[model samples]
Target chain A: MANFPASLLILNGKSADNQPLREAITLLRDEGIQIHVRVTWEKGDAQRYVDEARRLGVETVIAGGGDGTINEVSTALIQIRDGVAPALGLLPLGTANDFATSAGIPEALDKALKLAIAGNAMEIDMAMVNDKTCFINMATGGFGTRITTLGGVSYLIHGLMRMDTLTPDRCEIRGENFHWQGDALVIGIGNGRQAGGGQQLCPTALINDGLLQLRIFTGEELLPALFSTLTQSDDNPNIIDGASAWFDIHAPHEITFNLDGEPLSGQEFHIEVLPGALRCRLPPDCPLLR
Target chain B: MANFPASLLILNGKSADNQPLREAITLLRDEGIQIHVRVTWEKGDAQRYVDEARRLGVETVIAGGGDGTINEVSTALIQIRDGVAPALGLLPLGTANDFATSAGIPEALDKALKLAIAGNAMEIDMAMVNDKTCFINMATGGFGGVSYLIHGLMRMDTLTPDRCEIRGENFHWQGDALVIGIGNGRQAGGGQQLCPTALINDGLLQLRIFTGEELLPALFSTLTQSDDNPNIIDGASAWFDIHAPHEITFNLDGEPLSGQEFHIEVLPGALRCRLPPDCPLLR
Candidate 1:
């Protein structure tokens, strides 16, 4: 028998009229599983829903949307007393669903819901940027980082279109015993692999490994060729790459970081991994978990 | 009911008289499993035994001893007609079975042999060094290179770094490396996790370079913790071209080779080996 936990679904407002989702909820309730739903319309809605779930004694907080919605929900839940926080679950109702696809979370509506309720919760690492902002997936910045869409192919293509006007950011990056200062064309840090649709910036990154992957592309001449995906090979001397638990980044001017699709602009940022920061329901064979 | 495939265990000569190994074989045979064993006394015996296994219709070939013994058996099995080759299995009996432990293989002889017979074979990669030598676990150079020698002299001062230039794919690093670990399996030197994140089935070798700064003071950390070490640089690639200004000795799955230039290439899904379902080294 699956260990079905009482859950609250903090769903995106756009998916409110989804008939398959409604049917899945009805079927679960028929099986005597306690299921509650709250549709998020704007900012602060996900946080408010998370607080409501905690007060209602929900065991799991299922974030039903793209990476940004999931980020908002998990960041809110982690704010609760460490031990009392409900486990995070994902429904992956987004165009890209990058984190979901990487974690092996089901795309099918019913199966995804069932996994959220019945799957075992695994304690995984989430990242913190500048000691304030939190991200469960990754953080990206530098040339062509801003995206208007939540997380879609259009945002990715838009970033690619600005490549001709590429301007490197003057930044100093440091990690445990590692230091590099240069004009960085792109800064891709990852806890989960890939960004902007399926661009694998940090291909070997593992979410539960308790270490973050740092890859800084410095050369403008080789920028267009490596725009696709950074290969596993390490022959490119222009690219500065390594892994550390924490990284300190300083730029002369403000750098906009796309933290799981939410933008955070700052001059100095300290990014570190919070090992086993929260429990999340993931597939048994999740690739992100080392 | 378990699928008890007929297997031939090419055991290390040093472990020929091990009683636990004998008992394990007896128990397996009692379960109606056909287990033929050939003990290697010298060089060329493993290959000869492998040829015998094929002639006798063995379904699996178990390598019993350490990483060296496993390497010999698997390399021999890979030499057979690709699709018809028998699946390789590991029976860890050495002092430090790095590959076996990394793969989550059981320590008990009976359980290991049982799993060898019942486990499903998974296709995995093996590496070819200089287009000739083969290693299924890892290849290493610089200080503490040879597995057995390093295990014994780890505290001694005889070990030293090597000035090397390692080039592969988009990666290039030229520096004095305390140790160079190109791994298909994780640990070396008893339990030093040289390439902690190495995945056997990924068709790439995990390369770790430990630049010997404060080496002994922080030598005891696990592979997971190795990422936090500032002195270690990690990378992954299908092939590596390593050049040392002077002759540098390396151990490829226990066999030692001294050279100035070494070309290492990964042969992805080159062989079939039976492993635990939850094998840690699997990607």
Candidate 2:
């Protein structure tokens, strides 16, 4: 919480995974950063440890893990407090920490740790799908959601194959600013933009903008849309850039959605942008944090 | 608005219509209610007239029409004001004044006008579906929705012949119910009384799902008189989470509501409809 002080609690996702992480921890310790690190184990470790760290009167709760780990930690924090809570720090330890890349966090361990301890505090949005799944990065649904997981768009080109089991989906979408009812092959509700490694499904998504960006792909214009999804931007026709407040998705049957990479199936997903939901620590002059 | 003085205004749906209507207006005039009467003509008249009535400062703006006219007039009032505004008055002038009758307004024209002038002030629930269809009455969907609206038994396949997962505040249900009615007022058609246990002023919506066995027999009973209550969920919350597909083909009040899935909710007590002193649904 921004309310507390320089005390640090690191909820490490994969503590046994590496060496540079340890070296970075030692360097931060030598620099007198007053940080306490704990590795997450089993199911609810990130969730349990983050709240415990916040209760210990820490100003910053640095989440050291992948996008999934960040999702758990941040979702827990949102549950623990209603308004104004501890600021989040990202170590970006895992592959494809898409949120970290978008919100302007570094890749190197020492620099990431340095930014975590002394970075500027900024607020970011966390989206809730239904009442169960929480995502800080992006929630992806449809044909191309899960393919080509751990690298760049070139990886997707080789792995690109349609879901034979998939049928053309239909739904009516409505919100205060947008009302659309149509058939779609892929849909992305983005809070932090990129999903599926570095594929910018909602490229112009702003974490602190108090609005969520939506991208819907239909089967009618697959080739042009596929090219645009690989190209990355808001210039694509599928983007709902002014998405705000509550919106509903009605479909004929259940739809499987990937929240920050975790799969969940539901008949319809009611996604809402909880703006200023997380206060995070970022590197000084980080491009999107401001 | 509530800030204005307690005056009466009747935005009658049709002024050219026959009989005791003029007698009812005369009775109100003679009763010293000082009622200002206006007639609706063409599209947007209900909306514009309701705004004009509210803007002209009427405490009780009596809506004298059928369900469709009432939906438009009252919906316009809901849009023009927030928090609290002028109370709504109802006269069952048209064939199916479902909401007015459910709210216990008198059938007699003079009696309804009298209640509109000096009746008991009662706040009731109003529902907004898909941000387009505003229902002061109940919202019904599917083959069995209106009980006997379309193909009778022929339109059952298009009525979503599948099970859906519905979730909302403190309740969850899964089934293939033919007619789904989420109600503010207890009934819709001519005194059908679908949501048998709903209290309009309780600030909650009652969900009556008629998807069980003996579907036609049960619907006949549900639409005509209160027989067996269906799988009903009493929702104290305003929000109803329904994750269903091709299910937006519902009817709000009397009009069609077509969409896909719904994040539907009740705008509780946003409507202050004038009811009788002995109205049973007032509680």
Candidate 3:
């Protein structure tokens, strides 16, 4: 039987694990698929690899690394598309595969690669937060910005903790221009249900529905929010300070945010759903379809 | 201090701890407030109490018992208000003091009563679901209705086998018509952030935001809805699911929906926030 010639693009970084990349390349070779390695260890590598992949008519571009790498590759692919973009295949080698977990992708690199090679694809939603394409997650204003900052510190100190296990105490809240004093938490935009590793940040998020689910956890309910995540129950209603499909959070102080796991700085941001935006290799029995 | 003569309307049912009705009455006596007890063991008793309370010119009527009792008393109070109504108070002694919790009322019977007597009263947002003067909580087609059914069954089981925990396997995806299942978990109407136990000062909830915040096991990811609560970390990205005010869950089988043209608006400071003026409650 003849195998398909698909281009595989790998984004590289200091945190990028070579084990998954090696396994992915080996699996593609066994299946007679042409594999192209693109090392994105520095800036602009994402755009360069994307250009080459487009020139080579790449059908399936596997994002092999942490979320930062996956995000960059996915963003570049999305940018190169004139109408429809190539399907994305994520190999979970990151500290927290939040997007992978939400997509129902197996944590085991071999398993994810097997599913990807099988070529099951689904059209999922995407959004552009401040000119950057976000395939999985986004956050704006309030505690969300603080969490991003905390995440950066955690990475520096303890190398990124599980998002579900993150606490309000981990974040430092400073006085910002907007209503910073009152009850306010982070506003999380999810393409996948879990972010910060297994936290039911947007429990009702639907990837294919083409809508962004916003979860606002106010400061007063921070302890309850932590408890709720740990217990994994909806009994603690106070944990979710507020929720909406469309709203805005404007703060006076400039706060930093993380798209997937990449950090950026900004004060004001807007998030909305881009219906049926990106194509990704999904499992045959994907629950979203049912 | 001169205590006000308040009317205590007792709804039928015991407390979660199986305490007797007289025990709650005793607690009210201890507070030096005058009490008028009306026993509503049956449906008809509910109507009779409403009429009697109206005739007696009760300044404040206390709802004692569980959610059903609270619902019954609330219905009666609203009925009398159709002619002439008085202020309502709550003494939550139910298994799930959802209304009380939503109202920010204390869980303890004595404490809730004390707060009720000492706390000021306010008129909050109210909605009519299926032609009832709904007070707290609202639900529209989807998992909420399923939870309601499951909760009813679990109540019958008396939490014998850990029925309080609603697992994903228990979720009934009956398809389409099941979608019309909309409900306010505690209070369907009157933007009390606490739902049933909402504080008089909490004000009204102009919007009911639903995030598919269902808890499924990590292994059940294959069975759960994808993007059913995706996390948003970009401040620039829109981070909410907007529903118009006055939105109702119209069932198309088991699927729940917030159809287009449904208007959801926030009423800014419409309700007069009433709490104990002397207490250290902060808004």
Candidate 4:
């Protein structure tokens, strides 16, 4: 066994530092590795820790938070490396750890942290939606945006207690603006399957395929679109049928978009696939091409 | 108008004396033209008449039966013409005249026949399916075959006056198979949009363009490959969701599938598309 000195960066949000955080820390400490801990309670604290860690040349940075924190720390790490980036270990302590789950990370923090400490990582593809760098997921106009909005409110009310109550009605029931008619809904450019927890929004998604899988649900087809997102039956053709493979979407309207779990406001965006961009630690039998 | 002798060919099946057929013949005969009537009580009669008519060098061949009779006569006519086929006139007297509807032919027989006689004829793409020359409405596999089978039975029973008791449940149903699905249920290929009835103006469909339009359905998360006939949404981007300008499909599986209501089947088929050497029509 080799002694690998690492730093655990905990992102403090309402749902970030929970039982999962404590379990993740305990698992790494029990692995006989020297672990240094940093807590960011306020907004800039996470960035401050990331900046300080880079100054000390921390090789491997494990992000202990949800998708937002993971994105924040990963972005900081990418900025610090300039070109040569370090490995990212994720502890899925967010409301919907879609990226983490799709990466084959266990929902149980202890198991994930154990796997991380075991020095296993796979380089996966990451996408850039405008200026923001999103690892493992992408979103544009469609029901994908609606689900994200619903997820935010559901997380606030249910507080990451269970995953079942995040139904469509609960997530979609909102004021008139939430139901505004636009040209398109969320165009989820996915690198892996199953974003927003149970929605396999992109079934044929390949992380290293050198292309981004784009899911576009027309705003007009929203009502019937829910039938596809909710069920897995193959009998009904039109309900869930849309286009797939790889394409570019350029819409003029100011569309609501999200990356990983963070929301954004933008009008026109161009998305394309960058083949095999990162090295991730996956399971021995996990299907990562590289 | 100067008196010109226009020949009106009346081709009828078992349900020959229906009101629609009588009304169609009466209206056309009233327009100062000569009418020739041929009624087939069995198979092959329509084909023989079409061959005899072609041998006699008829100017235009009007088919006034259901799709099956139209298909038979059209195939014979194409055979007689040896690829340089004359124009075809259709009076849709079938159950689900999907091909006729796709061709912008109205369901009202008298009006449609008048338009067919006076209208300009244009050449359109055709698909060859199996050993039979079928039209390009849609092809069958698995449940699709069952649907086609059901549709054929429905047409047969509906045309027979005494057998109107046939219900939807009595139709033949079968297990699913790999169907080589084509165009909308209403349009012939992508020439016309069934739901909105939009017509494509440009005459060629590039492979790159088809692949792009198919990508959105590919990215959609919950697609099931077994049941759904993957439909291509009409456009490239969000705002430009209209029918493609140029679209084309080949006659596959040994059938000359056409947009026109001509019933023709090619056995030992020799019909080939004539194109300039530089054109990518064969591709």
Candidate 5:
């Protein structure tokens, strides 16, 4: 067996009782792979644990949760001011695992854990919202508020229940060689392919290409409009699709936006792609790669 | 100005009249970089120029064309079994530069030529087909004939499945394969990454077998979804022993070879390649 570097696994408290995950770690440890597991119980725990990982001199950190957990870990990693930061790995323990699924990360716990340590590490792009907050997967503007936190099925049900309140946000979105203005029902700025369970909002986005996919929905009906956007060409009248290195969104009223799972509200936002800012261990055939 | 080592460029004749490429070479030469250019007008010219490079004691040799030209230069470099060979560099001047684009080589002529001379040189794997011929990129079986680039895909009606038996040290498979991708580099045929996980530096070959023509849709969908499908069989081995019909011709980089018995093995660190620091095919 080839020797793997020592790693740290920061697991979500929700999966603290996962018995098979424990067994998988044990198997890796038995093979002389040094892996330390830390279970987070609160919001600020993952970043602190990542700091502890640096102190422990681990070369890899496996984020054993969903997109939010991975985002927190990656955000902490990119904040490393000096020297190279530890590479990030994924366990895909979230309910929807939209980022993991799009990245072609393995589904099985054992395989996912193994890939975390043995898979090839590649540098990928991350997006920064307003220069302060960073998101590894995607960011959405004027979408349903906090519905995705309930997971896939409940999120859709919440969307259906709130259908009567279909309100469009008046916003102006523009970037290099691209411009769109008027009421937009939803705006997706993706460094990854999908978001909100399996909604492929920015299907053509590649995380390593130094560009972000810009997809805007402007039609009346949500489902029909999305279908039209998905099937129609980029020049489709109802939907606006474009790609650029950075984008700016302006609005008169405070618009709700979600970065990964974290929420923010603002009238003006600047989203920029941080090219090759983070090193990630994704599947070899990962679709998010260019 | 960073000092670059002396190198020779074996340029394809098809791109001989390229004024921009000439300007780029002149710029490099004016920058005190010693680059001797030899334009190939025939099949045997590249190998002869490689010999000339060795005689001149150059450190690198740039292949200035598509995958086919790169393959020939790489094959020539790998044939030097006695000592360390000159490093192989690339300038993507082909119509569909599949390998160069996938490897993330610079697109601008000046930048690519500069990279070819001054980029990082890393050892990469090359596969020996039938223990006689070698391929730096891929060897496809039962695919569209001579489809090294995009236009090669236009003749899809000629697709025919081949019955083959494959054996490795710890692996075995016997079946009909509509398309087989044996890759040391990640991609072939324009932008299709048949062996996406293949690492150029790894001392193993990536093998993927497609069962039939009807499963072609999975090839496209599989690129987007992470689902591991049954239609594509993926394997990695240091060497592969393949048996097929005598009429079947296996296309290696753009060259064709036909035989009933094939012995393909990986020659680890066979060629030293000058690639960008962030080449996607590197592990």
Candidate 6:
């Protein structure tokens, strides 16, 4: 590792050590960016590290890992108020780097760290639901969220195998002059473009646009509907506008939804943008900025 | 009808001569509110009668029929802003009188006419969605919206207006189409007139809207048929609270409720107006 140019390179989590992340640290030192690497073993340790980094007035708090790690770190960063606006960088070191990949963070850890070292912060939108839950990528409900509840290939295996027993989520969405109550097979809410790695639930979502996109699939068998959504071209429902689908979802009956891959239940699941809510460092070539 | 007090009674629509309405008209004239009855021949007749009532400077433009007839008369009145606030009157006459029911206006034609002849006026809240269309009911969209913005008050000054900024997991909206706007006191704001196409208690409350021409005209007309406005909740039922930079918010809050999250089902007949016993809304 070469002498770094900036402050400390703090690696704050235990599971972050990998071939790419391991080598990228040396490359960060080579590039002369001061770095402080810390490890995390506890539930709140990651956030503490972030707070400490913000307290230190560090120019960048590079979050390294997959959606979980980044999600936690970004959430902590979001919870802050007027104190500092340190840029968030990502070293996506996980088997599932859904957010990083969609946002165009590179596979090469060195390149990712390099991007972090050279911070170009972008203010992306975030949200909170009834439980004050914070999720950045996406949320889903209905039978799809059930399948997603199984998660991964097991999701596919068991879903296809036990397809008969699934009941769709029935919800009634109400807001300013808006209401819809029915059985919907899928309710995909997008903050970023996709979720579960490459599933582009909202193909037109923008990180900096200060709005959320909602795409719902209703009235159908779940198998072919999702097959078409996942494989073929866009749903092309001819939505006249991007924000046309944002609704106030609530339980008309017994229904549960998932947020950024985590399951949660509530009487109401209200979601909306804070308009450029959080600040993050993006690579110069980040897809979101483009 | 009886030979009562006051000015002329112009029934604009073609169908106000039912047994109950006709009987009630005679009773209303007997009660000394006075009357000149004019039956409507065509579609625009109601609006024209409302216009003539305003031009003639009448004390009241008491409307008869269901939400459809009331909806039309009120539409004409609302269109004439700063001109006339002649109290809207309701005499329930439809198979399902939603506004009349919700507003506690009686269903017995005679009782409804008595209330219409002597009910107080309430400036019920109305909304202009996108400032283009006007509806006095509930509005909604998909997945719902909950925002928790924790920025400093200093950041609020820079927010741009007409920005449709919302966030959910995979659901976000960055456009500027004012998707929804709630209005008025009655939860069943435009029921029956529009409810044939949708259900009233569908969790979300929005006008069962029509195309621009017929739709816009119909909303105002349906609005005037009511009792007193009610002490309603922000929602028929639901709620959101936020602690953040005190500036912009979603249309749900003010200045902007977008920075945070907010809710309500509301019952409106509590307005300081009058109606007889056994009113549909009072029921």
Best by TM-score: 1
- What docking grade applies to model 5? incorrect
Clashes (N, CA, C under 3 Å) per candidate: 7, 6, 101, 42, 0, 99
- Model 5 per-residue lDDT tens digits across residues A11-124: 999999999999999998998899999999988898999999999888899999988899989999988877878889999796646788889888899998888988888999
For residue A71, model 3's alpha carbon misses the true position, in angstroms, by 1.3
Clashes of 4: 42
Worst 10 residues of 5 chain B by lDDT: B147-156
lDDT of candidate 2 over A209-272, digit per residue (tens):
8777777664433344555544332333333333556567776666667787677776677988
**Model 1 chain B: worst 10 consecutive residues (lDDT sum):** B147-156
Instruction: Kindly report which residue stretches of model 6 are placed more than 4 angstroms away from their true locations once superposed.
Output: A1-14, A143-166, A175-178, A227-247, B1-283
Model 2 regions lying over 4 Å from their true place: A1-15, A82-84, A143-167, A220-226, A229-242, B1-283
Q: Which docking category, incorrect, acceptable, medium or high, applies to candidate 1?
A: incorrect
Order of the predicted models by lDDT, top scorer first: 1, 5, 2, 6, 3, 4
Better of 2 and 5 by lDDT: 5
Q: Record all residue pairs in model 2 with backbone atoms less than 3 Å apart, i.e. clashing.
A: A1-A85, A1-A86, A250-B261, A251-B245, A252-B245, B177-B211
Overall local distance difference test of candidate 1: 0.79
What is the clash count of model 1? 7
Candidate 4, A10-87: lDDT as tens digits: 555665447656665776677666556676676567677877765655545677766667767766655543655556
Which is the leading candidate under DockQ? 1
Write one digit per residue (lDDT tens) for candidate 1, span B1-283.
2488788889998999999779877876887889999999876789999999998888899998888788888888888473488889889987758889989998877888878878999999999899878998878777435434554423334567767888887677665677777988887757666677788999898887766534553456765456555456788899999999888777887788877999999989888888999999898
Tens digits of lDDT, candidate 2, B121-182: 77777877766657777777674265464333223334544455566664555545566678
Off by over 4 Å in 3: A1-5, A15-24, A132-135, A138-182, A221-223, A229-237, A241-246, A253-255, A287-290, B1-283
Q: What is the DockQ of each candidate?
A: 0.09, 0.01, 0.03, 0.06, 0.01, 0.01
Give the least accurate 10-residue stretch of model 2 chain B, judged by summed lDDT.
B224-233
Candidate 6: tens digits of C-alpha lDDT, residues A1-290: 22222433345455555656666677666655567877676557768888788767776776666666677777777877866656677776755567788888767777767777665677877766664677777776655333333574235224322222345556665433344444556666767776665656677777777666665654444444444443232322211113422457877664566666556766577776666667776766766653
Q: Rate the local accuracy (lDDT) of all candidates.
A: 0.79, 0.65, 0.49, 0.45, 0.79, 0.51
Candidate 5: where are CA atoms >4 Å away? A143-164, A228-230, A233-235, B1-283
